[PDB]
C-alpha cells in the first residue's frame, strides 16, 4: 500500500484520488462524492509510484478526444484542445499559467455539452490538477532548465 | 509579361487597354501609359513549390510580423498543391 500513488475509482470519467485519501474511503456513491470524485462504474485503476500520472491522464484525454462524436462545440473543440495541452504538459513544454488555463478550459467544457462525455473528459483534468499541480510544475521546471 | 495591343497601347496586369475607337487615348499622346512591368501574375508562378512533409503547414509570408496573418493549409489532395490565400506560395506533400 505504501507504493500506491493514485487510484481512479470508477473509470476514466471519475476523477482520480491520491493515496492519502485512498487510506480510508468507502466505495459508495456518496462517500466518493465527498471525496471530490464519483463511484461511476466501480472500475478500480491503481497507479503505483513508478507511474507517470501526467502521462496516464494525457492518455485518458487522448482516448476521450478519439471517442468524441463531435456534435457539440465544447466537446468537439475543447477536448482536442485539452489533449494538445496535456501533450505539452507531459513533456513540460509549458509555463505555470497554462495549468490555470487548462482548469478554466475544463470548467468551460463542463455543463455545456449535450451529453456527459464532455464532463467525463473534463473531470480527469480537474482531478489531476487538483492533486498533482506540484508534479506538473516541477516537470515544467525541469524542461525549462534542460532547454537552456 | 507586358504586351502591346494592336493599337499600340500596353496592356496592364488587369487586362486594361483602351479600344482603337476610344477617344480616351488622347490623354496618352505626348505622355506614356503608366504601367507596372513586374506582373504579379507571372512573378508568383516560378516560385518553387515547397515539398512540405506534413499533412498541414502554416504560412506567415516570411518575417513574422512583416508578413501576412498566419494561416494553415491542408495538404491532403494529391491532385493539387495547397496555395496560401495571402501570398500565393504553394506547398505539396512529398509524393504522399
Amino acid at each position: 500500500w505504501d507504493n500506491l500513488l493514485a487510484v481512479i475509482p470508477g473509470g476514466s470519467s471519475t476523477p482520480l484520488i491520491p493515496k492519502s485519501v485512498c487510506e480510508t474511503v468507502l466505495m459508495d456513491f456518496d462517500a466518493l462524492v465527498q471525496a471530490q470524485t464519483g463511484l461511476g462504474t466501480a472500475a478500480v485503476i491503481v497507479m503505483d509510484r513508478s507511474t507517470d500520472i501526467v502521462k496516464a491522464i494525457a492518455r485518458l484525454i487522448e482516448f476521450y478526444k478519439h471517442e468524441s462524436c463531435g456534435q457539440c462545440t465544447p466537446c468537439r473543440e475543447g477536448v482536442d484542445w485539452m489533449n494538445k495541452v496535456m501533450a505539452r504538459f507531459v513533456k513540460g513544454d509549458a509555463r505555470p499559467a497554462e495549468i490555470d488555463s487548462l482548469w478554466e478550459i475544463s470548467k468551460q467544457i463542463e455543463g455545456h455539452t449535450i451529453c456527459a462525455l464532455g464532463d467525463g473528459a473534463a473531470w480527469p483534468v480537474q482531478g489531476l490538477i487538483r492533486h498533482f499541480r506540484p508534479e506538473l510544475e516541477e516537470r515544467m521546471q525541469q524542461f525549462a532548465l534542460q532547454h537552456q | 509579361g507586358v504586351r502591346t495591343s494592336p493599337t499600340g497601347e500596353k496592356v496592364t496586369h488587369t487586362g486594361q487597354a483602351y479600344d482603337d475607337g476610344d477617344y480616351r487615348r488622347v490623354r496618352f499622346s505626348d505622355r506614356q501609359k503608366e504601367v507596372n512591368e513586374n506582373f504579379a501574375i507571372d512573378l508568383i508562378a516560378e516560385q518553387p513549390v515547397s515539398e512540405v512533409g506534413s499533412r498541414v503547414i502554416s504560412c506567415d509570408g516570411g518575417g513574422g510580423a512583416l508578413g501576412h496573418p498566419r494561416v494553415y493549409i491542408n495538404l491532403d489532395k494529391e491532385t493539387k498543391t495547397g496555395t496560401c490565400g495571402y501570398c500565393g506560395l504553394q506547398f505539396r506533400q512529398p509524393h504522399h
Binding site: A97, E98, D100, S101, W103, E104 | -
Partner: protein, 95 residues
Amino acid sequence: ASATRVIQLLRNWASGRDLQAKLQLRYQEISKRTQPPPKLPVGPSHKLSNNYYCTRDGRREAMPPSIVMSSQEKKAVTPAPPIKRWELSKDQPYL
C-alpha cells in the same frame, strides 16, 4: 553651420548671459537617429486565466441616466461644496 573667443565675449556682453552654455543649435547632445530595437510591455489583461471579458467590460457597465424627478426643514443644497480660495505660489508669489 564655433565662434571665436573674441566674438563669444561680444555676443555674451550684448545679451548679458552665457549663450555658449545654452545654445539653440543641437550639435551632438541629441539622441542617435538609429536606436536599438524596443521590447514593448503588455497590458494588465494579458493573462492566461481569470481574464473573462465580463469583468473587464467597460461599455456594458454603463447604465442609462438615472432620473431623479419626472412630471408623470429641507435644507437648501448646492451642486458641490463651494470652491476654496487659491493660495499664492510659495515658489514665486509676485512676478
